[PDB]
Amino acid sequence: MLSERMLKALNDQLNRELYSAYLYFAMAAYFEDLGLEGFANWMKAQAEEEIGHALRFYNYIYDRNGRVELDEIPKPPKEWESPLKAFEAAYEHEKFISKSIYELAALAEEEKDYSTRAFLEWFINEQVEEEASVKKILDKLKFAKDSPQILFMLDKELSARAPKLPGLL
Amino acid sequence: MLSERMLKALNDQLNRELYSAYLYFAMAAYFEDLGLEGFANWMKAQAEEEIGHALRFYNYIYDRNGRVELDEIPKPPKEWESPLKAFEAAYEHEKFISKSIYELAALAEEEKDYSTRAFLEWFINEQVEEEASVKKILDKLKFAKDSPQILFMLDKELSARAPKLPGLL
Amino acid sequence: MLSERMLKALNDQLNRELYSAYLYFAMAAYFEDLGLEGFANWMKAQAEEEIGHALRFYNYIYDRNGRVELDEIPKPPKEWESPLKAFEAAYEHEKFISKSIYELAALAEEEKDYSTRAFLEWFINEQVEEEASVKKILDKLKFAKDSPQILFMLDKELSARAPKLPGLL
Amino acid sequence: MLSERMLKALNDQLNRELYSAYLYFAMAAYFEDLGLEGFANWMKAQAEEEIGHALRFYNYIYDRNGRVELDEIPKPPKEWESPLKAFEAAYEHEKFISKSIYELAALAEEEKDYSTRAFLEWFINEQVEEEASVKKILDKLKFAKDSPQILFMLDKELSARAPKLPGLL
Amino acid sequence: MLSERMLKALNDQLNRELYSAYLYFAMAAYFEDLGLEGFANWMKAQAEEEIGHALRFYNYIYDRNGRVELDEIPKPPKEWESPLKAFEAAYEHEKFISKSIYELAALAEEEKDYSTRAFLEWFINEQVEEEASVKKILDKLKFAKDSPQILFMLDKELSARAPKLPGLL
Amino acid sequence: MLSERMLKALNDQLNRELYSAYLYFAMAAYFEDLGLEGFANWMKAQAEEEIGHALRFYNYIYDRNGRVELDEIPKPPKEWESPLKAFEAAYEHEKFISKSIYELAALAEEEKDYSTRAFLEWFINEQVEEEASVKKILDKLKFAKDSPQILFMLDKELSARAPKLPGLL
């Protein structure tokens, strides 16, 4: 069974994995205002990955006989100054998610909860792919700041990641 | 182009189609606490339909050269008294969504916006299927109030509706 | 929910879509008395389309939580003077059905019933095909009034429309 | 050729095979008001069998060089007290159809009409299947009068008989 | 039947859907003078869509028993100052077509013509795709005004839309 | 390169190959008023052949580094006295097209333009098929002037030529 301090902190992180998806849906509503429908299709596909991260804390709380509480999801930022700053704010956010998985994992070792630190092993290994898949694109945008020719070619090459959920809906 | 009173009211309804999906995810977190994993798989599949409803207001605002603003999604109710009251509160919610589509459609006729009232024709025809797909199950639960044998058989027959997004995630 | 004046008028039109099928079955009993078994197979296939029109008012009343009342279907006319007058009386009947769909659609706009006027949109678009599929054949019979050679060739070309229900029964 | 007393009595029975189908469509409008959409899909499929019975008297009158006259189809009963009494009134009706086939068959032997008594041999052999397919379900409802668990399981097992005409319309 | 004021206004719009196709054939004769054979293959494929729009007013007038009158198609503009101004003049033209569909749809509601306003529902839903498929390309040309590298890459990516009629002719 | 007198005369003939298609679309709007939907489907398929003739002068002017100018297409005749006179006016028109190809071909030999007279060799060989495909049908209508039985059988046999563009649009 989950203790009161670990069930509350797994519920706070399930709220952060849904505010993540409600932030990558406020960036896709920003890039598709600029006409960058390959950046916007990159961000929507990341807002469906992050829903799949919150259905893993959800299925873990009901495997360990807990109870999921849903709080309010706050207002995400609307606009950024440039498509560079919209990825420096998505990479600063992925270092805020990982900072809070490491304080879940340092919480499960204090309470001697071996079946939770075994579960956070998936999210520690997967945030290494999340920080690097954004730092790749963030370094292609510092490679082209006053060059619309390259930004036109980043829109197309990132359009290979298309969301699969509108194909079902 | 969308007027200021119609772009604001299409943005308020995109917030209601995402609070819908954040309400059917607070019912799936209720039925899966009772051990009713067929009611909980019904509700998660409805929380992925309602995300697909908010990606239609989203793609309409960027077809009509607007701008999507995302507000905060409030706290949904946690627990209900019974699995009957958890569907009387999902049917009262589907009569609140439809009350606000009819005040979008009575707004687009006041502003003489023929390309928006043509778009809400999909959501008027589809809320007739949403109010009836809940009133079917709500009438099977008033048919069995002190009968766990039938509630055990509603859990299995509603488990045919499984969410397709965990199969991709 | 359907109001008392709209549930009564949807029930009157479900009685007209079954008297339609009981009129095209009194024309098929007329053309097959003259030996015109291609005109008679045209009319029986229209009496199975019109049953399919009354199973759409029927499924709409039980989607909107109503109650279908069945009145008596009156006696259709037995004989007409010619196979021309048996289509001038089927085209005058298809202008009587459409006159009553337009008084359902002008009733749903008076009561501000957006989910019924959305439903009658199918029957407004489909009576345009019904008035034209009879006016085609009615204009081929004014093209041949004292010519049995052409009436022998309208019997065969209209025999391509065969009823599918005797193939199952 | 058909005599005047046998053409009139074959036309009266073609009116009873269409009031049959307009009675099983007033029971399907009753069971689908109670939410029993497997009883209602049983009754609609019987209202398409009984139309196929009246297209056999119809094709026999035009094989024997007669003339089909269509009278008015009266008002069927609207509601019954229970789903038991809605099958005791469909079994009392199938003993009224068979009572009138036996008075057609005792009419064709009085007029020495061997080609009509040969034709009613199909309807005598088929009403034995009609009285027994209703007495099966009528005896499953006297087996469960104060048991909604079994009535919930008769709704599903009778839903295997689905009408084929809405699949074409 | 179509009234004299609605048959005249449906005939004026069939003349505008053929002057549309005779304008997108004067832009394809402009882009293929500049050597932009991907812009020119985009415009020819739009001049075959707009012929398909005038064969829908044509088939509607002969479903409603009218008469199509063909007036003269005026001289389209020959040259524009740039490939930007050749899309600002095709987007100003698609806001002139839609302004005249909305004055057909506001004409069919004044004459209480429900079967014409039901037909213009296709053209209201489809001009939303026409104004947006031009505003996409018009915003890619304001993204590159003094950049021939990007205009060379818009010629190729718009060459995926090839006209199907020279493949048959 | 094309001279000024040959570029102007190739542009005048591209205007005649589009007024041809706007004449066979005023005959299809005449035959489909008489209910002759096989004559009307013959004429629409000829109005798509003649568009394919004007896309050959168009692709030749941009192979020879010219410039296509589009003038106005005048009003075609609305009605003729009979379906005989609607083919005597389409055969008199096909002798007016061929009279002007022969004055293009006698113009390219005066200017010693061997690459244009080589191109008009296709249109000289193809107008022999156009004058004969109309003179076949024109001689079947002088074979039946007071015979609606044969005119009913010319409508069906000419309906094998169906336009392929509405199948794509």
PDB file of N, CA, C and O in Angstrom, chain C residues 18 22 25-26 28-30 32-33 44 48-49 55 58-59 62 66-76 78-79 164 168-169, chain D residues 18 22 25-26 28-30 32-33 44 48-49 55 58 62 66-76 78-79 164 168-169:
ATOM      1  N   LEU C  18     -45.412   5.762 -43.831  1.00  0.00           N
ATOM      2  CA  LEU C  18     -45.934   4.409 -43.965  1.00  0.00           C
ATOM      3  C   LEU C  18     -47.182   4.345 -44.821  1.00  0.00           C
ATOM      4  O   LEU C  18     -47.483   3.284 -45.367  1.00  0.00           O
ATOM      5  N   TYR C  22     -47.617   2.292 -48.367  1.00  0.00           N
ATOM      6  CA  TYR C  22     -48.863   1.595 -48.620  1.00  0.00           C
ATOM      7  C   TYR C  22     -49.610   2.205 -49.795  1.00  0.00           C
ATOM      8  O   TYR C  22     -50.707   1.755 -50.123  1.00  0.00           O
ATOM      9  N   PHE C  25     -47.430   0.409 -52.852  1.00  0.00           N
ATOM     10  CA  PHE C  25     -47.831  -0.986 -52.889  1.00  0.00           C
ATOM     11  C   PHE C  25     -49.241  -1.148 -53.443  1.00  0.00           C
ATOM     12  O   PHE C  25     -49.656  -2.267 -53.751  1.00  0.00           O
ATOM     13  N   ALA C  26     -49.972  -0.048 -53.599  1.00  0.00           N
ATOM     14  CA  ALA C  26     -51.214  -0.033 -54.352  1.00  0.00           C
ATOM     15  C   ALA C  26     -51.021   0.409 -55.789  1.00  0.00           C
ATOM     16  O   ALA C  26     -51.961   0.316 -56.580  1.00  0.00           O
ATOM     17  N   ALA C  28     -48.031  -0.794 -57.323  1.00  0.00           N
ATOM     18  CA  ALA C  28     -47.456  -2.054 -57.774  1.00  0.00           C
ATOM     19  C   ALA C  28     -48.518  -3.123 -57.928  1.00  0.00           C
ATOM     20  O   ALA C  28     -48.328  -4.074 -58.684  1.00  0.00           O
ATOM     21  N   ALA C  29     -49.627  -3.007 -57.204  1.00  0.00           N
ATOM     22  CA  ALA C  29     -50.770  -3.872 -57.429  1.00  0.00           C
ATOM     23  C   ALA C  29     -51.625  -3.394 -58.586  1.00  0.00           C
ATOM     24  O   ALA C  29     -52.590  -4.070 -58.943  1.00  0.00           O
ATOM     25  N   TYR C  30     -51.307  -2.232 -59.156  1.00  0.00           N
ATOM     26  CA  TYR C  30     -51.983  -1.751 -60.351  1.00  0.00           C
ATOM     27  C   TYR C  30     -51.184  -2.048 -61.607  1.00  0.00           C
ATOM     28  O   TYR C  30     -51.750  -2.502 -62.604  1.00  0.00           O
ATOM     29  N   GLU C  32     -48.979  -4.372 -62.001  1.00  0.00           N
ATOM     30  CA  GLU C  32     -48.854  -5.804 -62.202  1.00  0.00           C
ATOM     31  C   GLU C  32     -50.187  -6.431 -62.581  1.00  0.00           C
ATOM     32  O   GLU C  32     -50.239  -7.623 -62.896  1.00  0.00           O
ATOM     33  N   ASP C  33     -51.261  -5.646 -62.564  1.00  0.00           N
ATOM     34  CA  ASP C  33     -52.515  -6.046 -63.184  1.00  0.00           C
ATOM     35  C   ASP C  33     -52.511  -5.785 -64.682  1.00  0.00           C
ATOM     36  O   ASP C  33     -53.110  -6.550 -65.443  1.00  0.00           O
ATOM     37  N   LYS C  44     -42.535  -1.487 -55.926  1.00  0.00           N
ATOM     38  CA  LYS C  44     -42.256  -2.239 -54.706  1.00  0.00           C
ATOM     39  C   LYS C  44     -40.939  -1.821 -54.086  1.00  0.00           C
ATOM     40  O   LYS C  44     -40.809  -1.818 -52.861  1.00  0.00           O
ATOM     41  N   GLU C  48     -40.234  -0.049 -50.207  1.00  0.00           N
ATOM     42  CA  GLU C  48     -39.254  -0.451 -49.214  1.00  0.00           C
ATOM     43  C   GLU C  48     -38.291   0.670 -48.871  1.00  0.00           C
ATOM     44  O   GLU C  48     -37.653   0.615 -47.818  1.00  0.00           O
ATOM     45  N   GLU C  49     -38.139   1.659 -49.753  1.00  0.00           N
ATOM     46  CA  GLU C  49     -37.446   2.887 -49.383  1.00  0.00           C
ATOM     47  C   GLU C  49     -38.254   3.674 -48.366  1.00  0.00           C
ATOM     48  O   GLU C  49     -37.699   4.221 -47.413  1.00  0.00           O
ATOM     49  N   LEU C  55     -38.467   4.277 -40.467  1.00  0.00           N
ATOM     50  CA  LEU C  55     -37.565   3.776 -39.441  1.00  0.00           C
ATOM     51  C   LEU C  55     -36.484   4.774 -39.083  1.00  0.00           C
ATOM     52  O   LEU C  55     -35.596   4.441 -38.302  1.00  0.00           O
ATOM     53  N   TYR C  58     -38.578   6.850 -36.514  1.00  0.00           N
ATOM     54  CA  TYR C  58     -38.742   5.943 -35.386  1.00  0.00           C
ATOM     55  C   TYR C  58     -37.495   5.894 -34.519  1.00  0.00           C
ATOM     56  O   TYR C  58     -37.589   5.876 -33.290  1.00  0.00           O
ATOM     57  N   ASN C  59     -36.320   5.831 -35.134  1.00  0.00           N
ATOM     58  CA  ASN C  59     -35.087   5.820 -34.368  1.00  0.00           C
ATOM     59  C   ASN C  59     -34.720   7.195 -33.849  1.00  0.00           C
ATOM     60  O   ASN C  59     -33.883   7.292 -32.953  1.00  0.00           O
ATOM     61  N   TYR C  62     -36.897   7.593 -30.445  1.00  0.00           N
ATOM     62  CA  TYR C  62     -36.303   6.868 -29.334  1.00  0.00           C
ATOM     63  C   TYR C  62     -34.850   7.237 -29.069  1.00  0.00           C
ATOM     64  O   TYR C  62     -34.260   6.700 -28.130  1.00  0.00           O
ATOM     65  N   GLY C  66     -38.742   9.827 -26.682  1.00  0.00           N
ATOM     66  CA  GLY C  66     -40.139  10.053 -26.955  1.00  0.00           C
ATOM     67  C   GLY C  66     -40.938   8.770 -26.908  1.00  0.00           C
ATOM     68  O   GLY C  66     -40.568   7.794 -26.246  1.00  0.00           O
ATOM     69  N   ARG C  67     -42.055   8.768 -27.629  1.00  0.00           N
ATOM     70  CA  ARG C  67     -42.920   7.600 -27.703  1.00  0.00           C
ATOM     71  C   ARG C  67     -43.638   7.623 -29.043  1.00  0.00           C
ATOM     72  O   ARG C  67     -44.292   8.612 -29.379  1.00  0.00           O
ATOM     73  N   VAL C  68     -43.516   6.537 -29.797  1.00  0.00           N
ATOM     74  CA  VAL C  68     -44.112   6.435 -31.122  1.00  0.00           C
ATOM     75  C   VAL C  68     -45.531   5.904 -30.987  1.00  0.00           C
ATOM     76  O   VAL C  68     -45.755   4.846 -30.393  1.00  0.00           O
ATOM     77  N   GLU C  69     -46.493   6.640 -31.533  1.00  0.00           N
ATOM     78  CA  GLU C  69     -47.876   6.197 -31.611  1.00  0.00           C
ATOM     79  C   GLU C  69     -48.232   5.909 -33.060  1.00  0.00           C
ATOM     80  O   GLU C  69     -47.951   6.713 -33.951  1.00  0.00           O
ATOM     81  N   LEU C  70     -48.854   4.757 -33.284  1.00  0.00           N
ATOM     82  CA  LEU C  70     -49.218   4.283 -34.613  1.00  0.00           C
ATOM     83  C   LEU C  70     -50.724   4.426 -34.773  1.00  0.00           C
ATOM     84  O   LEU C  70     -51.486   3.826 -34.011  1.00  0.00           O
ATOM     85  N   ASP C  71     -51.153   5.221 -35.743  1.00  0.00           N
ATOM     86  CA  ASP C  71     -52.566   5.359 -36.048  1.00  0.00           C
ATOM     87  C   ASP C  71     -52.929   4.386 -37.164  1.00  0.00           C
ATOM     88  O   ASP C  71     -52.129   3.532 -37.548  1.00  0.00           O
ATOM     89  N   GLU C  72     -54.134   4.505 -37.710  1.00  0.00           N
ATOM     90  CA  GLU C  72     -54.532   3.627 -38.798  1.00  0.00           C
ATOM     91  C   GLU C  72     -54.055   4.176 -40.131  1.00  0.00           C
ATOM     92  O   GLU C  72     -53.998   5.390 -40.339  1.00  0.00           O
ATOM     93  N   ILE C  73     -53.681   3.272 -41.025  1.00  0.00           N
ATOM     94  CA  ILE C  73     -53.243   3.628 -42.370  1.00  0.00           C
ATOM     95  C   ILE C  73     -54.451   3.531 -43.292  1.00  0.00           C
ATOM     96  O   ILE C  73     -54.999   2.433 -43.447  1.00  0.00           O
ATOM     97  N   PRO C  74     -54.884   4.616 -43.925  1.00  0.00           N
ATOM     98  CA  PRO C  74     -56.157   4.620 -44.652  1.00  0.00           C
ATOM     99  C   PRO C  74     -56.083   3.828 -45.954  1.00  0.00           C
ATOM    100  O   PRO C  74     -55.043   3.307 -46.330  1.00  0.00           O
ATOM    101  N   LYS C  75     -57.219   3.748 -46.641  1.00  0.00           N
ATOM    102  CA  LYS C  75     -57.284   2.991 -47.885  1.00  0.00           C
ATOM    103  C   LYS C  75     -56.649   3.778 -49.020  1.00  0.00           C
ATOM    104  O   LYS C  75     -57.078   4.903 -49.295  1.00  0.00           O
ATOM    105  N   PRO C  76     -55.652   3.235 -49.705  1.00  0.00           N
ATOM    106  CA  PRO C  76     -55.064   3.930 -50.834  1.00  0.00           C
ATOM    107  C   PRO C  76     -55.963   3.804 -52.048  1.00  0.00           C
ATOM    108  O   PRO C  76     -56.877   2.966 -52.055  1.00  0.00           O
ATOM    109  N   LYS C  78     -57.270   2.581 -55.601  1.00  0.00           N
ATOM    110  CA  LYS C  78     -57.132   1.267 -56.217  1.00  0.00           C
ATOM    111  C   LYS C  78     -56.594   1.358 -57.642  1.00  0.00           C
ATOM    112  O   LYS C  78     -55.524   0.821 -57.945  1.00  0.00           O
ATOM    113  N   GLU C  79     -57.322   2.042 -58.520  1.00  0.00           N
ATOM    114  CA  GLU C  79     -57.000   2.097 -59.936  1.00  0.00           C
ATOM    115  C   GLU C  79     -56.915   3.542 -60.400  1.00  0.00           C
ATOM    116  O   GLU C  79     -57.585   4.430 -59.870  1.00  0.00           O
ATOM    117  N   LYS C 164     -34.936  -5.768 -52.845  1.00  0.00           N
ATOM    118  CA  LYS C 164     -33.978  -6.676 -52.232  1.00  0.00           C
ATOM    119  C   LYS C 164     -34.590  -7.508 -51.120  1.00  0.00           C
ATOM    120  O   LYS C 164     -33.988  -8.501 -50.705  1.00  0.00           O
ATOM    121  N   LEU C 168     -34.417 -11.835 -49.609  1.00  0.00           N
ATOM    122  CA  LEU C 168     -34.165 -12.294 -48.253  1.00  0.00           C
ATOM    123  C   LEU C 168     -35.369 -13.017 -47.676  1.00  0.00           C
ATOM    124  O   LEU C 168     -35.234 -13.765 -46.701  1.00  0.00           O
ATOM    125  N   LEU C 169     -36.544 -12.810 -48.256  1.00  0.00           N
ATOM    126  CA  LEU C 169     -37.767 -13.449 -47.793  1.00  0.00           C
ATOM    127  C   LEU C 169     -38.386 -14.300 -48.900  1.00  0.00           C
ATOM    128  O   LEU C 169     -37.943 -15.419 -49.165  1.00  0.00           O
TER     129      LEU C 169
ATOM    130  N   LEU D  18     -50.543  -7.825 -43.303  1.00  0.00           N
ATOM    131  CA  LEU D  18     -49.963  -6.495 -43.183  1.00  0.00           C
ATOM    132  C   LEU D  18     -50.384  -5.785 -41.913  1.00  0.00           C
ATOM    133  O   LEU D  18     -49.677  -4.880 -41.467  1.00  0.00           O
ATOM    134  N   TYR D  22     -47.902  -4.524 -38.875  1.00  0.00           N
ATOM    135  CA  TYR D  22     -48.163  -3.244 -38.248  1.00  0.00           C
ATOM    136  C   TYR D  22     -48.557  -3.411 -36.789  1.00  0.00           C
ATOM    137  O   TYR D  22     -48.849  -2.424 -36.116  1.00  0.00           O
ATOM    138  N   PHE D  25     -44.738  -3.939 -35.222  1.00  0.00           N
ATOM    139  CA  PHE D  25     -44.092  -2.639 -35.245  1.00  0.00           C
ATOM    140  C   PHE D  25     -44.679  -1.703 -34.196  1.00  0.00           C
ATOM    141  O   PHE D  25     -44.108  -0.645 -33.926  1.00  0.00           O
ATOM    142  N   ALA D  26     -45.794  -2.089 -33.582  1.00  0.00           N
ATOM    143  CA  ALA D  26     -46.304  -1.425 -32.394  1.00  0.00           C
ATOM    144  C   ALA D  26     -45.872  -2.110 -31.112  1.00  0.00           C
ATOM    145  O   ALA D  26     -46.100  -1.563 -30.031  1.00  0.00           O
ATOM    146  N   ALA D  28     -42.529  -3.359 -31.149  1.00  0.00           N
ATOM    147  CA  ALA D  28     -41.164  -2.850 -31.180  1.00  0.00           C
ATOM    148  C   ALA D  28     -41.108  -1.391 -30.776  1.00  0.00           C
ATOM    149  O   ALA D  28     -40.067  -0.918 -30.326  1.00  0.00           O
ATOM    150  N   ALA D  29     -42.201  -0.655 -30.954  1.00  0.00           N
ATOM    151  CA  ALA D  29     -42.299   0.691 -30.421  1.00  0.00           C
ATOM    152  C   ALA D  29     -42.688   0.694 -28.955  1.00  0.00           C
ATOM    153  O   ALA D  29     -42.736   1.763 -28.346  1.00  0.00           O
ATOM    154  N   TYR D  30     -42.990  -0.474 -28.389  1.00  0.00           N
ATOM    155  CA  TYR D  30     -43.248  -0.592 -26.962  1.00  0.00           C
ATOM    156  C   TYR D  30     -42.023  -1.080 -26.208  1.00  0.00           C
ATOM    157  O   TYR D  30     -41.693  -0.535 -25.153  1.00  0.00           O
ATOM    158  N   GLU D  32     -38.941  -0.803 -27.127  1.00  0.00           N
ATOM    159  CA  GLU D  32     -37.862   0.163 -27.225  1.00  0.00           C
ATOM    160  C   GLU D  32     -38.173   1.426 -26.438  1.00  0.00           C
ATOM    161  O   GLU D  32     -37.316   2.306 -26.323  1.00  0.00           O
ATOM    162  N   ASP D  33     -39.382   1.525 -25.888  1.00  0.00           N
ATOM    163  CA  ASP D  33     -39.688   2.529 -24.881  1.00  0.00           C
ATOM    164  C   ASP D  33     -39.237   2.092 -23.496  1.00  0.00           C
ATOM    165  O   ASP D  33     -38.827   2.930 -22.688  1.00  0.00           O
ATOM    166  N   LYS D  44     -39.081  -6.130 -34.766  1.00  0.00           N
ATOM    167  CA  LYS D  44     -38.919  -5.549 -36.096  1.00  0.00           C
ATOM    168  C   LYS D  44     -38.583  -6.607 -37.126  1.00  0.00           C
ATOM    169  O   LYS D  44     -39.003  -6.498 -38.279  1.00  0.00           O
ATOM    170  N   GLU D  48     -40.846  -7.775 -40.619  1.00  0.00           N
ATOM    171  CA  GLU D  48     -40.359  -7.942 -41.976  1.00  0.00           C
ATOM    172  C   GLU D  48     -40.589  -9.347 -42.500  1.00  0.00           C
ATOM    173  O   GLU D  48     -40.571  -9.546 -43.716  1.00  0.00           O
ATOM    174  N   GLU D  49     -40.761 -10.328 -41.614  1.00  0.00           N
ATOM    175  CA  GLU D  49     -41.247 -11.636 -42.035  1.00  0.00           C
ATOM    176  C   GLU D  49     -42.693 -11.550 -42.493  1.00  0.00           C
ATOM    177  O   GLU D  49     -43.072 -12.166 -43.489  1.00  0.00           O
ATOM    178  N   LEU D  55     -46.453 -10.614 -49.406  1.00  0.00           N
ATOM    179  CA  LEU D  55     -45.966 -10.651 -50.777  1.00  0.00           C
ATOM    180  C   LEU D  55     -46.048 -12.036 -51.382  1.00  0.00           C
ATOM    181  O   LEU D  55     -45.577 -12.229 -52.501  1.00  0.00           O
ATOM    182  N   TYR D  58     -49.790 -11.852 -52.503  1.00  0.00           N
ATOM    183  CA  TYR D  58     -49.779 -10.886 -53.593  1.00  0.00           C
ATOM    184  C   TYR D  58     -49.291 -11.509 -54.891  1.00  0.00           C
ATOM    185  O   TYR D  58     -49.844 -11.240 -55.958  1.00  0.00           O
ATOM    186  N   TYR D  62     -51.657 -12.522 -58.525  1.00  0.00           N
ATOM    187  CA  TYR D  62     -51.263 -12.181 -59.882  1.00  0.00           C
ATOM    188  C   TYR D  62     -50.661 -13.345 -60.656  1.00  0.00           C
ATOM    189  O   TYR D  62     -50.319 -13.170 -61.827  1.00  0.00           O
ATOM    190  N   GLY D  66     -55.827 -12.427 -60.795  1.00  0.00           N
ATOM    191  CA  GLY D  66     -56.769 -11.747 -59.942  1.00  0.00           C
ATOM    192  C   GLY D  66     -56.488 -10.263 -59.860  1.00  0.00           C
ATOM    193  O   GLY D  66     -55.895  -9.661 -60.761  1.00  0.00           O
ATOM    194  N   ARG D  67     -56.919  -9.662 -58.755  1.00  0.00           N
ATOM    195  CA  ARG D  67     -56.704  -8.243 -58.520  1.00  0.00           C
ATOM    196  C   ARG D  67     -56.637  -8.013 -57.019  1.00  0.00           C
ATOM    197  O   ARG D  67     -57.558  -8.392 -56.292  1.00  0.00           O
ATOM    198  N   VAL D  68     -55.555  -7.393 -56.564  1.00  0.00           N
ATOM    199  CA  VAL D  68     -55.334  -7.146 -55.145  1.00  0.00           C
ATOM    200  C   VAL D  68     -55.974  -5.818 -54.769  1.00  0.00           C
ATOM    201  O   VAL D  68     -55.686  -4.784 -55.379  1.00  0.00           O
ATOM    202  N   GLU D  69     -56.847  -5.843 -53.768  1.00  0.00           N
ATOM    203  CA  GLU D  69     -57.431  -4.639 -53.202  1.00  0.00           C
ATOM    204  C   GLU D  69     -56.885  -4.424 -51.800  1.00  0.00           C
ATOM    205  O   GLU D  69     -56.851  -5.350 -50.986  1.00  0.00           O
ATOM    206  N   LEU D  70     -56.461  -3.195 -51.527  1.00  0.00           N
ATOM    207  CA  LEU D  70     -55.852  -2.816 -50.259  1.00  0.00           C
ATOM    208  C   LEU D  70     -56.857  -1.986 -49.475  1.00  0.00           C
ATOM    209  O   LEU D  70     -57.281  -0.927 -49.942  1.00  0.00           O
ATOM    210  N   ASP D  71     -57.247  -2.464 -48.302  1.00  0.00           N
ATOM    211  CA  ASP D  71     -58.130  -1.713 -47.427  1.00  0.00           C
ATOM    212  C   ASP D  71     -57.286  -0.926 -46.430  1.00  0.00           C
ATOM    213  O   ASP D  71     -56.063  -0.856 -46.548  1.00  0.00           O
ATOM    214  N   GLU D  72     -57.923  -0.331 -45.427  1.00  0.00           N
ATOM    215  CA  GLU D  72     -57.175   0.411 -44.426  1.00  0.00           C
ATOM    216  C   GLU D  72     -56.669  -0.519 -43.337  1.00  0.00           C
ATOM    217  O   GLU D  72     -57.323  -1.502 -42.981  1.00  0.00           O
ATOM    218  N   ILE D  73     -55.482  -0.220 -42.831  1.00  0.00           N
ATOM    219  CA  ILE D  73     -54.873  -0.981 -41.746  1.00  0.00           C
ATOM    220  C   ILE D  73     -55.220  -0.282 -40.437  1.00  0.00           C
ATOM    221  O   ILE D  73     -54.811   0.869 -40.248  1.00  0.00           O
ATOM    222  N   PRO D  74     -55.935  -0.922 -39.519  1.00  0.00           N
ATOM    223  CA  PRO D  74     -56.469  -0.226 -38.344  1.00  0.00           C
ATOM    224  C   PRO D  74     -55.381   0.115 -37.330  1.00  0.00           C
ATOM    225  O   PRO D  74     -54.217  -0.217 -37.501  1.00  0.00           O
ATOM    226  N   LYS D  75     -55.787   0.793 -36.260  1.00  0.00           N
ATOM    227  CA  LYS D  75     -54.836   1.207 -35.237  1.00  0.00           C
ATOM    228  C   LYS D  75     -54.461   0.028 -34.353  1.00  0.00           C
ATOM    229  O   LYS D  75     -55.346  -0.588 -33.751  1.00  0.00           O
ATOM    230  N   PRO D  76     -53.184  -0.309 -34.232  1.00  0.00           N
ATOM    231  CA  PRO D  76     -52.783  -1.387 -33.348  1.00  0.00           C
ATOM    232  C   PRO D  76     -52.791  -0.911 -31.909  1.00  0.00           C
ATOM    233  O   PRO D  76     -52.846   0.304 -31.661  1.00  0.00           O
ATOM    234  N   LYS D  78     -51.404   0.282 -28.376  1.00  0.00           N
ATOM    235  CA  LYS D  78     -50.221   1.084 -28.088  1.00  0.00           C
ATOM    236  C   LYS D  78     -49.345   0.446 -27.013  1.00  0.00           C
ATOM    237  O   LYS D  78     -48.182   0.117 -27.265  1.00  0.00           O
ATOM    238  N   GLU D  79     -49.897   0.257 -25.818  1.00  0.00           N
ATOM    239  CA  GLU D  79     -49.143  -0.215 -24.669  1.00  0.00           C
ATOM    240  C   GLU D  79     -49.820  -1.430 -24.058  1.00  0.00           C
ATOM    241  O   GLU D  79     -51.041  -1.586 -24.118  1.00  0.00           O
ATOM    242  N   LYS D 164     -32.662  -7.278 -41.327  1.00  0.00           N
ATOM    243  CA  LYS D 164     -31.709  -7.110 -42.414  1.00  0.00           C
ATOM    244  C   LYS D 164     -32.031  -5.917 -43.294  1.00  0.00           C
ATOM    245  O   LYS D 164     -31.175  -5.488 -44.071  1.00  0.00           O
ATOM    246  N   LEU D 168     -29.771  -2.531 -45.409  1.00  0.00           N
ATOM    247  CA  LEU D 168     -29.870  -2.133 -46.803  1.00  0.00           C
ATOM    248  C   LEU D 168     -30.427  -0.727 -46.943  1.00  0.00           C
ATOM    249  O   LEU D 168     -30.261  -0.096 -47.993  1.00  0.00           O
ATOM    250  N   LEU D 169     -31.087  -0.224 -45.908  1.00  0.00           N
ATOM    251  CA  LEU D 169     -31.663   1.112 -45.924  1.00  0.00           C
ATOM    252  C   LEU D 169     -31.068   1.972 -44.811  1.00  0.00           C
ATOM    253  O   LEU D 169     -29.956   2.489 -44.931  1.00  0.00           O
TER     254      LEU D 169
END
